[PDB]
Write an enzyme that holds these catalytic residues in place. Structure first.
Site, PDB file in Angstrom:
ATOM      1  N   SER A   1      39.778  45.649  41.001  1.00  0.00           N
ATOM      2  CA  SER A   1      39.216  44.880  39.913  1.00  0.00           C
ATOM      3  C   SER A   1      38.936  43.446  40.419  1.00  0.00           C
ATOM      4  O   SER A   1      38.295  43.293  41.397  1.00  0.00           O
ATOM      5  CB  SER A   1      40.089  44.929  38.624  1.00  0.00           C
ATOM      6  OG  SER A   1      39.245  44.616  37.470  1.00  0.00           O
TER       7      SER A   1
ATOM      8  N   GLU B   1      34.848  53.765  34.235  1.00  0.00           N
ATOM      9  CA  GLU B   1      35.222  52.377  34.375  1.00  0.00           C
ATOM     10  C   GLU B   1      35.074  51.667  33.038  1.00  0.00           C
ATOM     11  O   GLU B   1      35.895  50.834  32.721  1.00  0.00           O
ATOM     12  CB  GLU B   1      34.347  51.668  35.435  1.00  0.00           C
ATOM     13  CG  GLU B   1      34.568  52.129  36.874  1.00  0.00           C
ATOM     14  CD  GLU B   1      35.832  51.601  37.512  1.00  0.00           C
ATOM     15  OE1 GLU B   1      36.640  50.934  36.860  1.00  0.00           O
ATOM     16  OE2 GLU B   1      36.060  51.879  38.703  1.00  0.00           O
TER      17      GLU B   1
ATOM     18  N   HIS C   1      39.773  52.442  34.359  1.00  0.00           N
ATOM     19  CA  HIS C   1      39.776  51.346  35.247  1.00  0.00           C
ATOM     20  C   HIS C   1      41.235  51.040  35.486  1.00  0.00           C
ATOM     21  O   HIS C   1      41.955  50.759  34.540  1.00  0.00           O
ATOM     22  CB  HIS C   1      39.074  50.220  34.584  1.00  0.00           C
ATOM     23  CG  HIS C   1      38.888  48.978  35.409  1.00  0.00           C
ATOM     24  ND1 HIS C   1      37.981  48.903  36.464  1.00  0.00           N
ATOM     25  CD2 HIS C   1      39.396  47.728  35.251  1.00  0.00           C
ATOM     26  CE1 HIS C   1      37.941  47.659  36.904  1.00  0.00           C
ATOM     27  NE2 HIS C   1      38.787  46.929  36.191  1.00  0.00           N
TER      28      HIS C   1
HETATM   29  O1  TJH Z   1      41.386  42.485  32.523  1.00  0.00           O
HETATM   30  C1  TJH Z   1      41.386  42.515  31.269  1.00  0.00           C
HETATM   31  C2  TJH Z   1      42.567  42.569  30.474  1.00  0.00           C
HETATM   32  N1  TJH Z   1      43.757  42.569  31.085  1.00  0.00           N
HETATM   33  C3  TJH Z   1      44.974  43.007  30.403  1.00  0.00           C
HETATM   34  C4  TJH Z   1      44.925  44.539  30.459  1.00  0.00           C
HETATM   35  N2  TJH Z   1      45.226  45.122  31.801  1.00  0.00           N
HETATM   36  C5  TJH Z   1      44.605  46.188  32.378  1.00  0.00           C
HETATM   37  C6  TJH Z   1      44.244  46.100  33.742  1.00  0.00           C
HETATM   38  C7  TJH Z   1      43.606  47.192  34.330  1.00  0.00           C
HETATM   39  N3  TJH Z   1      43.387  48.282  33.609  1.00  0.00           N
HETATM   40  C8  TJH Z   1      43.747  48.397  32.300  1.00  0.00           C
HETATM   41  C9  TJH Z   1      43.479  49.601  31.603  1.00  0.00           C
HETATM   42  C10 TJH Z   1      43.848  49.758  30.242  1.00  0.00           C
HETATM   43 CL1  TJH Z   1      43.460  51.127  29.414  1.00  0.00          CL
HETATM   44  C11 TJH Z   1      44.493  48.741  29.589  1.00  0.00           C
HETATM   45  C12 TJH Z   1      44.750  47.566  30.299  1.00  0.00           C
HETATM   46  C13 TJH Z   1      44.382  47.362  31.651  1.00  0.00           C
HETATM   47  C14 TJH Z   1      43.203  47.211  35.733  1.00  0.00           C
HETATM   48  C15 TJH Z   1      43.179  45.799  36.265  1.00  0.00           C
HETATM   49  C16 TJH Z   1      44.462  45.112  36.025  1.00  0.00           C
HETATM   50  C17 TJH Z   1      44.504  44.917  34.522  1.00  0.00           C
HETATM   51  C18 TJH Z   1      42.514  42.624  29.050  1.00  0.00           C
HETATM   52  C19 TJH Z   1      41.303  42.622  28.355  1.00  0.00           C
HETATM   53  O2  TJH Z   1      41.245  42.658  27.121  1.00  0.00           O
HETATM   54  C20 TJH Z   1      40.149  42.565  29.098  1.00  0.00           C
HETATM   55  C21 TJH Z   1      38.960  42.557  28.374  1.00  0.00           C
HETATM   56  O3  TJH Z   1      39.048  42.612  27.015  1.00  0.00           O
HETATM   57  C22 TJH Z   1      37.755  42.497  29.020  1.00  0.00           C
HETATM   58  C23 TJH Z   1      37.790  42.461  30.406  1.00  0.00           C
HETATM   59  C24 TJH Z   1      38.988  42.472  31.155  1.00  0.00           C
HETATM   60  C25 TJH Z   1      40.193  42.515  30.515  1.00  0.00           C
END
Ligand code: TJH
Ligand SMILES: *[C@@H]1O[C@H](CO)[C@@H](O[C@@H]2O[C@H](CO)[C@@H](O)[C@H](O)[C@H]2NC(C)=O)[C@H](O)[C@H]1NC(C)=O
Ligand code: NAG
Ligand code: NAG
Length: 534
Positions: free
Chosen positions: A199, A326, A439
């Site tokens: 990411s 994704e 993702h």
């Molecule tokens: O990175 C986040 C983000 N980070 C906190 C959630 N963490 C997650 C991460 C990842 N995948 C996630 C996948 C899910 Cl289903 C829930 C939280 C996730 C992979 C990268 C490391 C962070 C929260 C968001 O609300 C968000 C958005 O709304 C839009 C773009 C990015 C993000």
């Protein structure tokens, strides 16, 4: 004093701790400082190297996590909570962690993990980033670094040396300097450092490949679902300026000069910044983050696209790829009509609204081109197709197609590209089915979690993790994920002409070509031309 858990480095002496892993043991050195605490009047500045210390640095426990927004959309739900800080937060957070085989090797492959989280969140200390399984199973020294996120890492007032921008990327670079200078004492070879991340971590990896001042600090690179040219991953200095000024305004600050603005922001407690940071975005959207890297002319000497076209980047081998779905995460969290406990069938109308949120830069003609490219007009009210269509729009636009553009440009000048498509939906996933292969959910295969019985993966998932771990480690070691002369199926090189890639799942390897080309020609060539003309 001479023992396995005692290491002498150029910054001083460090004491590790012995750590059990799959019926054996390895050493871990947790919470080593690579920089001075960026606190007080150092908030927003370039990091400074940590002052060497007298005595023995106790590296038996995880350090603090950087100050960041904490996800509370699903209080106590393990699927969201596995991403939040599992340690206290502090601005004093520039530490790294190291897992070393036992007995201590002499000169082995080093992998350095750079965490994601949209540049506003992330932690080196999470359970899914525990390096012990991979260090142990593949006999590598596994490092994880940390770096300032949000305003602390990325507030940018270009011209000013007090808050110049990109300091979180300079944090990463300082850790990589430290590894270059000191990993030999842990048994790592500083000549064979692979940087890897997911990411924004993947974007960061691509960014160190591009930046002249980072290139010499590592040999090879792996990018998981992120690309330095992703639309979310960078902004112009004017846009950076704007957001910093706006952040000031949300906090009653004095906007008259850079110095007055910075002085005010430095007085605020960390949570005060975090409470208003989501109020500075220019558009209503999803997959967009507030404080991110800036195209400054220094860390990045020209625009990313000009660097890619002219070959102004490190030429080495890279291994990279994407997950099948994704977009699903960002739709769940940010778009109307998607929810965790429903199948999230989507009306025509929540579709059009999803589109507008997903491509905020687009004018009406643009929104019409996207809608047409992703709508099956024989069946335009299938709520499933609409849901899936938006999932694909977000994934293709924000992750896949930018990665495919990076890949095709890099591969012209580089020295070996291996491309994957991870499409395995884990049997114990806690998120609903509609979200598919989410993702961030390859990470756990990359860090070997499925080898731990208790976590409830299948045997074929254990084997897929072992296979992925071994491709990533073998690649870090040699620049090629395939074992010479073994009888296993071969992951072929991605070439400009043939564009080969493999799926990563529990089934026999299969090789394909031209990953999502139809949609990436839309997103990489047609749509930007449409928006530049109108
Ligand atoms: O990175 C986040 C983000 N980070 C906190 C959630 N963490 C997650 C991460 C990842 N995948 C996630 C996948 C899910 Cl289903 C829930 C939280 C996730 C992979 C990268 C490391 C962070 C929260 C968001 O609300 C968000 C958005 O709304 C839009 C773009 C990015 C993000
Ligand atoms: C990666 O770079 C090396 C060289 O730095 C390439 O190997 C060379 O290939 C050329 C052209 O075939 C030969 O004349 C040399 O004999 C090779 N040098 C060495 C040290 O082997 C290699 O092909 C490159 N790989 C890719 C995929 O571009
Ligand atoms: C090192 O300090 C940590 C910090 O709380 C502590 O938990 C641990 O017992 C200490 N070990 C040594 C060898 O000092
Ligand atoms: C493994 O499965 C059991 C039985 O259904 C469950 O209670 C337990 O929470 C699972 N463990 C983990 C870490 O998910």
């Amino acid at each position: 004093d001479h023992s396995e858990l005692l290491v002498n480095t150029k910054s001083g002496k460090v004491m590790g701790t012995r750590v059990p892993v799959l019926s054996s043991h390895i050493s871990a050195f947790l919470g080593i400082p690579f920089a001075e605490p960026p606190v007080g009047n150092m908030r927003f500045r370039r990091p400074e190297p940590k002052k060497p210390w007298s005595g023995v640095w106790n590296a038996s426990t995880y350090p603090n996590n950087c100050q960041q927004y904490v996800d509370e959309q699903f209080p106590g739900f393990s699927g969201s909570e596995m991403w939040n800080p599992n340690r206290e937060m502090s601005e004093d957070c520039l530490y790294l962690n190291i897992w070393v085989p036992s007995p201590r090797p002499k000169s082995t492959t080093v992998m350095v993990w750079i965490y994601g989280g949209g540049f506003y969140s992330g932690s080196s200390t999470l359970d899914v980033y525990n390096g012990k399984y991979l260090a142990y199973t593949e006999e590598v020294v596994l490092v994880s670094l940390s770096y300032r996120v949000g305003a602390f890492g990325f507030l940018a007032l270009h011209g000013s040396q007090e808050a110049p921008g990109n300091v979180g990327l300079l944090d990463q670079r300082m850790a990589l300097q430290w590894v270059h200078d000191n990993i030999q004492f842990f048994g790592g070879d500083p000549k064979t450092v692979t940087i890897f991340g997911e990411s924004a971590g993947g974007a960061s990896v691509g960014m160190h490949i591009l930046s002249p001042g980072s290139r010499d600090l590592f040999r090879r690179a792996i990018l998981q679902s992120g690309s330095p040219n992703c639309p979310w991953a960078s902004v112009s200095v004017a846009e950076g300026r704007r957001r910093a000024v706006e952040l000031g305004r949300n906090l009653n600050c004095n906007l008259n000069s850079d110095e007055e603005l910075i002085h005010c922001l430095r007085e605020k407690k960390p949570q005060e910044l975090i409470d208003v940071e989501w109020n500075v975005l220019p558009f209503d959207s999803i997959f967009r983050f507030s404080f991110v890297p800036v195209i400054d002319g220094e860390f990045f000497p020209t625009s990313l696209e000009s660097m890619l076209n002219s070959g102004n980047f490190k030429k080495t081998q890279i291994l990279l790829g994407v997950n099948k779905d994704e977009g699903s995460f960002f739709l769940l969290y940010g778009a109307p009509g998607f929810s965790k406990d429903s199948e999230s069938k989507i009306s025509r109308e929540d579709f059009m609204s999803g589109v507008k949120l997903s491509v905020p830069h687009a004018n009406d003609l643009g929104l019409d081109a996207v809608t047409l490219q992703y709508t099956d007009w024989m069946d335009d009210n299938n709520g499933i197709k609409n849901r899936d269509g938006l999932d694909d729009i977000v994934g293709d636009h924000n992750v896949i197609c930018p990665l495919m553009h990076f890949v095709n440009k890099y591969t012209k000048f580089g020295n070996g590209t291996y491309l994957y498509f991870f499409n395995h939906r884990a049997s114990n996933l806690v998120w609903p089915e509609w979200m598919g292969v989410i993702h961030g959910y390859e990470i756990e295969f990359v860090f070997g979690l499925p080898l731990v019985k208790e976590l409830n993966y299948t045997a074929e998932e254990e084997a897929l993790s072992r296979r992925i771990m071994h491709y990533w480690a073998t690649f870090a070691k040699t620049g090629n994920p395939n074992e010479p002369h073994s009888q296993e199926s071969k992951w072929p090189l991605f070439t400009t002409k043939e564009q080969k890639f493999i799926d990563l799942n529990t089934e026999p390897m299969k090789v394909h070509q031209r990953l999502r080309v139809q949609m990436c020609v839309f997103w990489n060539q047609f749509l930007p031309k449409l928006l530049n003309a109108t």
